[PDB]
Amino acid sequence: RSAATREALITGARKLWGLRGYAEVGTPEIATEAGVTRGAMYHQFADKAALFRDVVEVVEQDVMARMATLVAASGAATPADAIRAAVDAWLEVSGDPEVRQLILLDAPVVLGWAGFRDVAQRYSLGMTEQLITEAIRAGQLARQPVRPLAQVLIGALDEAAMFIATADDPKRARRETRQVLRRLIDGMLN
Amino acid sequence: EERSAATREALITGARKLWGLRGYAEVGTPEIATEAGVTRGAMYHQFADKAALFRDVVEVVEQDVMARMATLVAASGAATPADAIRAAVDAWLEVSGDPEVRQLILLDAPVVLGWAGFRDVAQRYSLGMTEQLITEAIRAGQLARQPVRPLAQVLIGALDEAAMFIATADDPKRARRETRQVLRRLIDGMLNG
Numbered sequence A: 001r002s003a004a005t006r007e008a009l010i011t012g013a014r015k016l017w018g019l020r021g022y023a024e025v026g027t028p029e030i031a032t033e034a035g036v037t038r039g040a041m042y043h044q045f046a047d048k049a050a051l052f053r054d055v056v057e058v059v060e061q062d063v064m065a066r067m068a069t070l071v072a073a074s075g076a077a078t079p080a081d082a083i084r085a086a087v088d089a090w091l092e093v094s095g096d097p098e099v100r101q102l103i104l105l106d107a108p109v110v111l112g113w114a115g116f117r118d119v120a121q122r123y124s125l126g127m128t129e130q131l132i133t134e135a136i137r138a139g140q141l142a143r144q145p146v147r148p149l150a151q152v153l154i155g156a157l158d159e160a161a162m163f164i165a166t167a168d169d170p171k172r173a174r175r176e177t178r179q180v181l182r183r184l185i186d187g188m189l190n
Numbered sequence B: 001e002e003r004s005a006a007t008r009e010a011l012i013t014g015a016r017k018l019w020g021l022r023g024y025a026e027v028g029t030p031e032i033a034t035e036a037g038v039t040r041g042a043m044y045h046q047f048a049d050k051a052a053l054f055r056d057v058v059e060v061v062e063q064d065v066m067a068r069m070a071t072l073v074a075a076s077g078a079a080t081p082a083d084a085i086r087a088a089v090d091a092w093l094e095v096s097g098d099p100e101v102r103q104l105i106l107l108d109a110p111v112v113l114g115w116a117g118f119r120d121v122a123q124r125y126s127l128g129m130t131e132q133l134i135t136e137a138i139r140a141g142q143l144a145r146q147p148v149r150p151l152a153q154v155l156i157g158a159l160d161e162a163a164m165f166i167a168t169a170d171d172p173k174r175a176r177r178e179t180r181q182v183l184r185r186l187i188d189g190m191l192n193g
């Protein structure tokens, strides 16, 4: 009922904002894409930013699912190779035009830095801490505090993706950034 | 004329002090005018609104952050580019740990300036110094030849997240010790020297 309306609105908002950006699409156009009235939409979402918060949750769930599948697919043989594949998986997924627009460009603006940090960490800290713990257990990464390392790596990878997202030559930005991240990772791994 | 130049400096000083202590959201422009000893009319002549005064406060705070980083690196006695990078990382944790810098740069500025605004300021102050330390290390053979701007950007993201993690940690003393250790391991893995 309400759940059907909310799911229609989130789907339509993800599609249209994914293509043209948060700033360029109003709630009435999203209501039309979804097949609901303005009244029904206003009942479910106070304002545009509330609908965007639910869009970011569903997109982040999909980002983390896709990254897990690419890492499972990579044929990584050790925890060190799992971390290298996880970095390749992030650059691949964050290079999706919808992810670029909603997560890398719009979410930091609409959510704020604190908001974006909270979402990024809520979705990514667990996977990141896991990869670090497995590398430490396999003797391929120095025993060190896991959470601070995970935090710093997430900040590095988020900034890498945002640099590529806004680069004048994104093809070259991506190749050069991937080399930077490999050197950084490889200096930690043994 | 001289009265107005004095008023502008008094407002920036008083706003920096009070917002530094209690946060942007907790201090209004009337209290800042009173602190500075000027009328609301004199404050309104200098600053269209509260956020315009905050933008000028961020500029003098950022100038002092970058000056203090340069001072702490000069004071380290670093003799090589590699040792200057190690000193610069320790200097950022020290400077970003100043309670006024924490409150105005790490907490208030992203909110008041917005994302685009805050990133533009952060880059204007930090990218130059960072790229210079990287170029010197590459020239000295202490860092592999590579494109400078992508490395600078990734390291700035790492260092910004380190500072924000300490700023909001349950135990900031421990967060800072542990973050300093992981950043030292990270740069020592990349530096030939």
Ligand SMILES: CC(C)Sc1nc2ncnc(N)c2[nH]1
Binding pocket: A060, A063, A064, A067, A086, A087, A090, A103, A119, A120, A123, A124, A127, A128, A154, A157, A158
């Ligand atoms: C996969 C991780 C090693 S890196 C990462 N950064 C992120 N930022 C925003 N949303 C996410 N899901 C992120 N994941």
Ligand SMILES: CC(C)Sc1nc2ncnc(N)c2[nH]1
Binding pocket: B062, B065, B066, B069, B088, B092, B105, B121, B122, B125, B126, B127, B129, B130, B156, B159, B160
């Ligand atoms: C230059 C390096 C220590 S990293 C750095 N990130 C920053 N963010 C905001 N304002 C600054 N001055 C910053 N410096």
